Structures are given as C-alpha cells and as structure tokens.
Amino acid sequence: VSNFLKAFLHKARDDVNVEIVFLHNISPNLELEALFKRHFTQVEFYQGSVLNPHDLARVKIESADACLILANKYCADPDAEDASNIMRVISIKNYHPKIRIITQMLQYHNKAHLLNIPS
Amino acid sequence: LLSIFISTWLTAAGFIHLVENSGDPWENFQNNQALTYWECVYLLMVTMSTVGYGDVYAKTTLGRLFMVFFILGGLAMFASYVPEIIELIGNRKKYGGSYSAVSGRKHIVVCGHITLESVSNFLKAFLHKARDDVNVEIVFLHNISPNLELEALFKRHFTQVEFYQGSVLNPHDLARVKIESADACLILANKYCADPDAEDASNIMRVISIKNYHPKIRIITQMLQYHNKAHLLNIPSWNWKEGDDAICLAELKLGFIAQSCLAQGLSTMLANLFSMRSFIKIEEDTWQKYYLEGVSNEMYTEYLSSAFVGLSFPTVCELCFVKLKLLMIAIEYKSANRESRILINPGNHLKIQEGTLGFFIASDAKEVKRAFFYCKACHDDITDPKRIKKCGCNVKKYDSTGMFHWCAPKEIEKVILTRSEAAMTVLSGHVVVCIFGDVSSALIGLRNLVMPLRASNFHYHELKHIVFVGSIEYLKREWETLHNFPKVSILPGTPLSRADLRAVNINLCDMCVILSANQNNIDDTSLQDKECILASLNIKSMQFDDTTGVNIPIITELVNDTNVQFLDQAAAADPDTELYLTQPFACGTAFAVSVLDSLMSATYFNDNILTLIRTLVTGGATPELEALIAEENALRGGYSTPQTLANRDRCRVAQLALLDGPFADLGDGGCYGDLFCKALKTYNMLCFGIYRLRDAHLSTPSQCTKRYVITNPPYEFELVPTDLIFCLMQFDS
Amino acid sequence: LLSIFISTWLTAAGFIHLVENSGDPWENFQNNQALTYWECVYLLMVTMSTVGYGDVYAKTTLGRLFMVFFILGGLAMFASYVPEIIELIGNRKKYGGSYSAVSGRKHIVVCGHITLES
Amino acid sequence: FALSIGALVIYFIDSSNPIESCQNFYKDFTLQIDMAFNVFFLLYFGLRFIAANDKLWFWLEVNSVVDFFTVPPVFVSVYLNRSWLGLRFLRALRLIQFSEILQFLNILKTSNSIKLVN
Ligand SMILES: CC(C)CCC[C@@H](C)[C@H]1CC[C@H]2[C@@H]3CC=C4C[C@@H](O)CC[C@]4(C)[C@H]3CC[C@]12C
Ligand SMILES: CC(C)CCC[C@@H](C)[C@H]1CC[C@H]2[C@@H]3CC=C4C[C@@H](O)CC[C@]4(C)[C@H]3CC[C@]12C
Ligand SMILES: [K+]
Ligand SMILES: [K+]
Numbered sequence A: 001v002s003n004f005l006k007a008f009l010h011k012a013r014d015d016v017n018v019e020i021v022f023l024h025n026i027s028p029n030l031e032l033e034a035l036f037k038r039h040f041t042q043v044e045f046y047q048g049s050v051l052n053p054h055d056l057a058r059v060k061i062e063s064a065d066a067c068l069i070l071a072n073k074y075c076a077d078p079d080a081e082d083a084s085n086i087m088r089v090i091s092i093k094n095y096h097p098k099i100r101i102i103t104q105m106l107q108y109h110n111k112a113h114l115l116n117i118p119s
Numbered sequence B: 001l002l003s004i005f006i007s008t009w010l011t012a013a014g015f016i017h018l019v020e021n022s023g024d025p026w027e028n029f030q031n032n033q034a035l036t037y038w039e040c041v042y043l044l045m046v047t048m049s050t051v052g053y054g055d056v057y058a059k060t061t062l063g064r065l066f067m068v069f070f071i072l073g074g075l076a077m078f079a080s081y082v083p084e085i086i087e088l089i090g091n092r093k094k095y096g097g098s099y100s101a102v103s104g105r106k107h108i109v110v111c112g113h114i115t116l117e118s119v120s121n122f123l124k125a126f127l128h129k130a131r132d133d134v135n136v137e138i139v140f141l142h143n144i145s146p147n148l149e150l151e152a153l154f155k156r157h158f159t160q161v162e163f164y165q166g167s168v169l170n171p172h173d174l175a176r177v178k179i180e181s182a183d184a185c186l187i188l189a190n191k192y193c194a195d196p197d198a199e200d201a202s203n204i205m206r207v208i209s210i211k212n213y214h215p216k217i218r219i220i221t222q223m224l225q226y227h228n229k230a231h232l233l234n235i236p237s238w239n240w241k242e243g244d245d246a247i248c249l250a251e252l253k254l255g256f257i258a259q260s261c262l263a264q265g266l267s268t269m270l271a272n273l274f275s276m277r278s279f280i281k282i283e284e285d286t287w288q289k290y291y292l293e294g295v296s297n298e299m300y301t302e303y304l305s306s307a308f309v310g311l312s313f314p315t316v317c318e319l320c321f322v323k324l325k326l327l328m329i330a331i332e333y334k335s336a337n338r339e340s341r342i343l344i345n346p347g348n349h350l351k352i353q354e355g356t357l358g359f360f361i362a363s364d365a366k367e368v369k370r371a372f373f374y375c376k377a378c379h380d381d382i383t384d385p386k387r388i389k390k391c392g393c394n395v396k397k398y399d400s401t402g403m404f405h406w407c408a409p410k411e412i413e414k415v416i417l418t419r420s421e422a423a424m425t426v427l428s429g430h431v432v433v434c435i436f437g438d439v440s441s442a443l444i445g446l447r448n449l450v451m452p453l454r455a456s457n458f459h460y461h462e463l464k465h466i467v468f469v470g471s472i473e474y475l476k477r478e479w480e481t482l483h484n485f486p487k488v489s490i491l492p493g494t495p496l497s498r499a500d501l502r503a504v505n506i507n508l509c510d511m512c513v514i515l516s517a518n519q520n521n522i523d524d525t526s527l528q529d530k531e532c533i534l535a536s537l538n539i540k541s542m543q544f545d546d547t548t549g550v551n552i553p554i555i556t557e558l559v560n561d562t563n564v565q566f567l568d569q570a571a572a573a574d575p576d577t578e579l580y581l582t583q584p585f586a587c588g589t590a591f592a593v594s595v596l597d598s599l600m601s602a603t604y605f606n607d608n609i610l611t612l613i614r615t616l617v618t619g620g621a622t623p624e625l626e627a628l629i630a631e632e633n634a635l636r637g638g639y640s641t642p643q644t645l646a647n648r649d650r651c652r653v654a655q656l657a658l659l660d661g662p663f664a665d666l667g668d669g670g671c672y673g674d675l676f677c678k679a680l681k682t683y684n685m686l687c688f689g690i691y692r693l694r695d696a697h698l699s700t701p702s703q704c705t706k707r708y709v710i711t712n713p714p715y716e717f718e719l720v721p722t723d724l725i726f727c728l729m730q731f732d733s
Numbered sequence C: 001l002l003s004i005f006i007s008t009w010l011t012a013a014g015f016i017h018l019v020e021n022s023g024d025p026w027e028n029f030q031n032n033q034a035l036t037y038w039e040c041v042y043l044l045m046v047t048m049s050t051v052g053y054g055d056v057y058a059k060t061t062l063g064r065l066f067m068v069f070f071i072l073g074g075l076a077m078f079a080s081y082v083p084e085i086i087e088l089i090g091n092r093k094k095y096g097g098s099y100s101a102v103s104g105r106k107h108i109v110v111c112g113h114i115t116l117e118s
Numbered sequence D: 001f002a003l004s005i006g007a008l009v010i011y012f013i014d015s016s017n018p019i020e021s022c023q024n025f026y027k028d029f030t031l032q033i034d035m036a037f038n039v040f041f042l043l044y045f046g047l048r049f050i051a052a053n054d055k056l057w058f059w060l061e062v063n064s065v066v067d068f069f070t071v072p073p074v075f076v077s078v079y080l081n082r083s084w085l086g087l088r089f090l091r092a093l094r095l096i097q098f099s100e101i102l103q104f105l106n107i108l109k110t111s112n113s114i115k116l117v118n
C-alpha cells in the first residue's frame, strides 16, 4: 500500500479526481491504519472479499473507473497466488464484464490463463 | 469486603458525631450542632455516594477538615479496591448451563465439527422456508468457544437454535443437553483435515459415547472414508433397522459423479429430488419455467394397498402413473431368506406381495396416500384423481458376490502410459478423470468412482475406459484399491497442461471429471475452487481440428455454491441467483457438495431415502459385500456360478435419443405419457425425466448444445425430436 | 502526581478566595461574600469530588464563571491522567510471594509438569 | 454561519428583556437586522428546498426544524407588532457545522483534530 500510494499519489501529478478504495478481508494493523489516516481525504478502506458479490456491490464496482489487483511478491508458491488473482479477476468480470482490470502476475506462464476468460 | 466497608462507615459516622456534638475547643464549645448518630450515618452514606443533598452537613472546622480527609481516603480506597470488585464480578460463562425441555417440543442435538461453514450449510438445509410446520429445536454441543460471526449466526436464529459448551465424551454434558429425550443425534465430520482416519475414529468414539449413555437414541453420522463405517458394525447397540445411519460423503459424491458419467444431469435431478425449493412462478417463454415445472417434485415412501397384491410391477406402475398420477420408482422386497432389499424397477416376472413399501415421486405428500386407499371396485370408474375418496370396496471375471467386473491384479507399471504412448493409441467414448492430487494430500477414495462404472450390470464391451490424469505420487497411494478393475489407465502429468489433455483425446471422451484433493491446505474457503475452475475454463477454451472445447461434457466438483456461476461464460443475469437456478447446476455440469448436507436433512424426516439413494447410486452394493470388504479390505474374485449370474440381472441408468430409435415416430409432437406407457409395457423401461436442449423453445436456430433437466413431466407434456429420455433399462443377455 | 494535584487545588482555592472576597467591579464591590481561604479549600474539595453540598458556594458572577471553568478543566485533567493512575495501580502478581510455614503442619512441594490432568 | 452567530448574539442581548413585550418596528433597530438575517435564512431554506431529491428527508432535518421555529415566529412578530423570545436559541445548533468551516479555510488537516472539534 505504501509503494502504491507513493507511485500513484504524487505531488508532481497533475490535477486528477480519482479516489482510491481498498478492499481486503484482513483487518489492518495500527501502522497501516495510521497510513490511511494520513491520506483520509483521498483514500478509503472497506473490509470485504472480492469473491463475495455483495462486497463488490458495496464498493460500487459497477461505476469504478478500473480495478487494480496487487500480488504477494513474497510467497512460498507463486502459482497459488497467481491462481487466486485469476479467481479474483474471474469474479470481478462475472459481476461486471465491462470493467477495466489491471492485475499483477508473478509467473509468466500463468498469465495465459487470463486468455481463457471470455470477457 | 462488606465487613470492611461497614466498619469504616460506622467508625467514620461515630467520629463525625463526636466532633460535631462536642464543638470546637477554641470557640469555647459554642458552635456545637445537635446531630444524632444515625443522622451522621445518613450524612456519611450521602457523602460516599457523591450525592450531597446538603440538608445535613458538618458546620465545625474540625468536622469539615475530617470530612475532607474522609472524602480523600474513601476515593483512594475505592480506587484501590476496584480490582477486587471486578474479580468478584468475574467472567460470566456465556454458554454454560443446561437445555430446558418443553413438553410437545422435540429437539435434536448436533455435535462434531461445529464451525461457521458447516453450521451455516446445516441450517440452510434444515431450517428452510418451504419446510412444513415442524416443532424441532436444534441444540449444538461443542467444546470450542464460537467466534463473533458464528455467534451472530446463532443470534439470527435464537428462536429455534441454541448452543451449549461441552463435550460429547463427557456424560455430564450429555445430561445437560437432555440427550435421553432428544429425537436424534446428528454428527458432522470435518471434511477438510489432513488425516480422514483420525476424524472417522473421533466420530466413532462420539457414537460409542452417545450409545453408552443412551442405547435407544437414533444417530445419523457423517463418515469421510468408506472403509471406516464398518467399525460402526462393531457397536452392539448400533441398530441400522431402527434408524441409525452413516452418510459417507466420498462414496455418495463419487457415486453421483459416476451416475452422471453414465447419464449426464442425474446428479442435478437427484439433488433437486430431495431438496426443498421455494416456489417461484415464471411466465416468460424461457427454459426456467420448464425447469421449475420439474423442480417441484419430491420423493416419498408409502405402503401399497391390498388391491395391488398379486399384480406385476409394470402393471401397478402404469396404474399409478395413469390413474393416481404417481411415478412409482422402486419397491422394498421382503424375503426372510435375504432380509429386505430395495428393487429398482423390477421386471414383470415379479409380483407385489402383502405390505410392500414403495417409493414414489410426487409434487405433494397429500397425493401419495392414493396408493394406500385405492380399491378397484369403487375407484376404477373415477377419472379425475382428486375425486377418488378413501372408500374401501475356469477364469475369474467377476468378484465373489458376482456384482462387479473383476480382473487379475496387475502392477501399476503395466497401466502407466507416456504422452507419446497415449497419443499413439486411440481413445473414444471414454472417461477422463483429472485429479489435483499430491503426495501429502488426503485420500479421496477413488474406488467409489470406479465401482459404479465397473458394475456387472454392464457388458464388457459396454464398459467405458477410465484414464486418470494427475500426479503419479498421489495415484500410487490409491492403486491398492483400483488394481482389480479391468480397464484403468494412468497418464502422469498435470490436468492444467493442454498436451496431456490432447494426448488422451479430450474431445472424444464421454465425460471429463475434475476433482481436487488439496482442499484442507487453503485457509480461505472461497479460494478452495481455484484449480477446478481454472481447469474447466482451460478445457472450454481449447481448439481442435480434423472444433472447440465448449461442447466437451465436463463435471466439476465445487465446494462453494457462489463459485458455480463462474462456470458459465455468459454474464450473470443476477449475482444473487440461487444455486438450483444457475445454468451450470441445472445442466448437470457442476456438482456442489452442499447438496450432501441437504441429504442428511432428507434422512432425518425419512430414513428410506438414504437407502434408496445408496442402492440406486453406488451400483447396488449389498451388506454381504460390505462385510466381505470389511474382512479383507479388498475385492475378492470368484468363479461364475448360476446364483451369481442370476445376481447380475439388475436395472441401469441410461439416456436414450428419439432421433432414430423405436420411439422416433412419437418424439415429433407426441405426449410423454404415451412414451412412458409404451416403454413400460414393451421393454419394461421406466422413463423418469427429459434432458432437453436449452435453445429448443426458441424459434431461431442456435449452436448451443447445452441441455437442462425436467424431472417427471406430466402426461400431456409435449416432446421434440431433439430430446433425451432418462430411463432404467433392464439387463439383457 | 500528588504535588501537581495539591498545587492545583491550592491555587484554585486561593483564586476563588480572591474573586469572592474582592467582589464584582461593575457592582461597586457590593456583592462581596465573607469567605475564608480554608472555606474555599473545602469548597474546591467538595466540588472536585462531585458531591456539592451547597452549604458554601460562589455568589459573584466572576466566581461562578471561574467555577465553571475549573469544573471543565478538572474533568479534562482527570480524564487525561487516568492512564497514569492505572499504571501506578499496575498489574498485581497473583501468585507471587512465599509460603508461610505453620508449626505442627507438614508441607510437601510438587513441581515438574504442572497441568490440569496431572 | 456568520449570520447564525449574529442571531445568537442578538438573542443573548435580547434575553435580558421580558419574555413578552411590544416594540415598534420603526423605532427599534435590532429587530430590523434580525429580520434581515431571517429573510436570508428563509431564502437559503427555499433554495435547499427546490434543490431536494426527496422532500420528506429534507423536511425532517434539524436545520429545517430550526428554520420553521425561527422564521414563521418573526413573521408573526412583525405582523402583530409584538415580540416573544420563543425558541430563538435553536440557532446555536449551527455550531455543529463549525468544524466544516475549519476544513474549508485549511485550518484543520488531521482527522483527529477535526473529530475533536466536532
Ligand atoms: C487513630 C486515632 C484514634 C487517633 C487520632 C486522634 C483523634 C481521634 C483525636 C485527636 C484530637 C481529638 C479532638 C480534640 C478536641 C475535641 C473537643 C472535645 O470536646 C472532645 C472531642 C474533640 C473533637 C476531640 C475528638 C478526638 C480527636 C479528633
Ligand atoms: C494566568 C493568570 C495569572 C492571568 C489571568 C488574569 C486574572 C488572574 C485576573 C484578570 C482579571 C482579574 C480580576 C479583575 C477584577 C477584580 C476585582 C478587584 O477587586 C480585584 C480582584 C479581581 C476579581 C481580579 C482578580 C484577578 C483577575 C481574575
Ligand atoms: K456525583
Ligand atoms: K452530587
């Protein structure tokens, strides 16, 4: 989250009216909550699961500009993380097929699975 | 504490009394205030409560000074003594206590694996809106304190569900929940564990403890492995004839999958047959209305009337279908020589005896009692069913029991095929089982998938080749129970690799079954279906030449219902659609394990449903075969004898097309009733459902080959030539 | 902590004494109340404990205003200083201490694997 | 908000007067600026009313209730040429919006300070 906010919310960035909404099922710890409070005017957080359509309805995924999926770069099995990200993409596209998705993939041979999604 | 408080109160009150009544020495005792001792007690109590009316107070200098000191000391003492007050209050046990029995209010006790998903599925299956008025209260017993979400789940159903903390192995906790007056005890298993044998042993211990406390209680338990349930026969008080039942998840699930391999959509039909679905009315010309016309049917048991005694089974079935509008599937033949056995659609050579139980498929239970109050003398002339009243006027080829195909044992090296070797041979009309196994993964008992497909009811040339695609390390741990079957081959590899799928000719197979074994490793429950969904999407997107994988028949095992809609390429019409209304479920291409959690409920209200499903789905396994498998932990071959050859004659599930068969002249606009009557009279064939193309009611042509299931259509139901008929076909030699 | 509390108490009592004995300037010092310093100390202690007998109280406008401000400030200070009071109370060691021998009363000592079942 | 503070100050000044009294509009000057504030409040209320997606939820907010209990009574007072104190103190509820202004002028940045001021 710190790296993504450093790259995205930058001082030299031109005037852009994009609000970042984080969706994750794990409750944040104190330091990351303080990080959100530092950027409370532009960044919001909601507890929920991508695989649950109700949580997707909560964050108004039907009107979002795009959906950005970050990967766990430090894991024992990259294939499991890639499969989980592909499942998240499948769920998001099942809820709303017209949304733009930018995802992170760990292994190069797994991204071909993204060609199996018709949408 | 109370003594200290009272002594301090009284001492302070007396000291204030003395200083107030005496007066200040330096004022020559002229500022004294007439103030009784009890008034000082009242003043001290008003002060210590921080109320301070001011009606009585200290007027002297010494009195005010001592009041200030008493206020300071009392505040300090209270601040110091707060922790002891907290310890006296203590930590209240939220779920301690005992169940309070209510007269005229039955209760059942649920124990075992009490977690969020299991409890949610059990309550969804049991506490259903469409369920009739039933006065059963659910009492959960578990030694692990619930978490916040599961506590909220209990609070949602606080009027019908209670929870108590305790252990089944402790007789006192059994006495708390009033197990001596409970209707039944239901034991749930941990489906996601490293060692299924330990969970099975724990469940058997729970059964032993419950039966030791009260031998007459009815028990319905869940068993993970098929070979462990024989231990339940070692308990002297385990009476199967009195309602004690064990539901084997792996056996029933793999039997459903195998029967769907023989005839696709049968798992959906069975799941909708014993599940309670809310009534929804649809008038638009879509496939949902034709589906819902068949969802409404349920399964019941009834005792046949004395008028049916001496008549053949086809005659009684035809009379039930035409007159009473009931589909009578099976009977319970009782012979003291061979106890009682459920016969699925017996031939015309068998006659109905006295007091024989029969199994019916009907929309409502009220219309089932027709078979009990039917008299030909006063009801034959009646045409309208609702008008009928209750008026009375050298080489081993089969196993020891001769009910499964058997072969000499062979080493695993003789069945392993390389990719080039698999591509060299040609496989057509076979079954491909993709397995996401692992060397450290839990066994799923693949034998329960092969035995229904290797039953003696089929001929040798009608047997379908089985090709297992998966890790060889996992498959070596299962080969000890699969090496006695004739046609089984192994391709070591990965189901996600397209080369392995192309090697086994996945475009020519009769069925592809995707199974997962690494379910316990994933902590998140919704991500347990990633590999199966990815494999299904990979297979559906493949291209073939002489044309695409969208027409390949696939059955996918799924844990979560919400993932089933992920198997449909078309966009979800509504993400809140129920499981039974989704296209993958209605087409039989997806198998949600949660329907098994419904079956237990169907077992509680009727114990014959489980026995009928076991004798229809598992290929006809008998208790004698159960005892032999318990004794030897394997299948023993034997030479053919006339008794075993007579045991071969059964009925099998099949699908028939009306394009070029003997019924082709009737499929073009004819009614279903004529087809049923002709099939029953001529070939002794029992039709019980239609597998119909999804884009058949549409006038415009379509390239979709998906079909949905219509269960027990009415007599006047129209037929189209592009239809399949579910049937129970007799064995022919 | 005690020094801060006592200094605040004495300063507030003296300030109330001054404003009450001096009287309101705009009333030409005609609403003054004869009130000794120790009586103001007593009044401050009765106020801070939320008892409030009402036998002695501030009658002037300035006195009442300053009493309102002192009540607000004392409540805020107490709410801020509660955690330090908790730290002073601390976590009592429940099983610390030593065994008290009794004459004519033998005792044995059990150690090792001390769990529920054992 | 500034006019709300002004109306609150005018109410504070007028509280010394008797509850019911008669006073000429031409002779008095404070009542003129009171009505000058009140007509602006009425225009603001009408502007919010016409720009309302749902009339019930807008009609059941605290600001609307304050307007209803403030502006009709001052119209009645100017019609009848008699003054009543009434519920003119309810304008103080506008102070609930104060923190928002401290966010408009970039005075407050941290959310903790914003919620403390609220
Ligand atoms: C721990 C305790 C017992 C020791 C403290 C001494 C206390 C109890 C003594 C010391 C000074 C004494 C006071 C001195 C003067 C007078 C006036 C006279 O008419 C008798 C009562 C009275 C009001 C005394 C009451 C008791 C007293 C307060
Ligand atoms: C931090 C402190 C020291 C600064 C605040 C100033 C305080 C102490 C000042 C400002 C106004 C002063 C008051 C103004 C008027 C009078 C009336 C006169 O008879 C003297 C006392 C008295 C009642 C004063 C007491 C002290 C006072 C309250
Ligand atoms: K109090
Ligand atoms: K009080």
Ligand SMILES: [K+]
Pocket: B050, B051, B052, B053, C050, C051, C052, C053
């Ligand atoms: K009081």
Ligand SMILES: [K+]
Pocket: B052, B053, B054, C052, C053, C054
């Ligand atoms: K009082």
Ligand SMILES: [K+]
Pocket: B272, B273, B274, B275, B276, B277, B295, B296, B297, B298
């Ligand atoms: K049904």
